[PDB]
């Protein structure tokens, strides 16, 4: 049912994403956001997969969507910052990495992936 439908796209999309088939894994997690739309993981993995095929325009939106279902998902912010970085919205990516450190007061990705925003 509508619960197990959300795991089906998790396992099936994950087994594609870890195999390097990010494009195939997107179409999996897509079914779950349309079946449930309440787990922040489904949009977070679709965002990561889009970010692995340099679709930062699509991965910005799916990172935002994961933050709308959770609000406390520090990874969904760091992922959004990595999208907005290579999208040219570098200063918007900073506003996302500065958040990751509120939710994780030692995050090495939030210190490092943010340092790229500030460099020449």
């Amino acid at each position: 049912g509508p619960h197990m439908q959300a795991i089906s796209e998790k396992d099936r999309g994950n087994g594609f994403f870890k195999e390097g088939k990010y494009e195939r894994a997107i179409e999996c997690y897509t079914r779950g956001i349309a079946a449930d739309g309440a787990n922040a993981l489904l949009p977070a993995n679709r965002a990561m997969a889009y970010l692995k095929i340099q679709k930062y325009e699509e991965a910005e939106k799916d990172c935002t969507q994961a933050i709308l279902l959770d609000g406390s998902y520090s990874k969904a912010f760091a992922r959004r910052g990595t999208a907005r970085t290579f999208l040219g919205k570098l200063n918007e990516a900073k506003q996302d990495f500065e958040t990751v450190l509120l939710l994780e007061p030692g995050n090495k990705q939030a210190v490092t992936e943010l340092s790229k925003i500030k460099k020449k």
Binding site: K10, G13, N14, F17, K18, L41, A44, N45, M48, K75, A78, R79, T82, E104, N107, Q109
Partner: peptide
């Protein structure tokens, strides 16, 4: 590997 962002949940 660890509490990292590029791993899927």
């Amino acid at each position: 590997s660890g509490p990292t962002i590029e791993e899927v949940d």
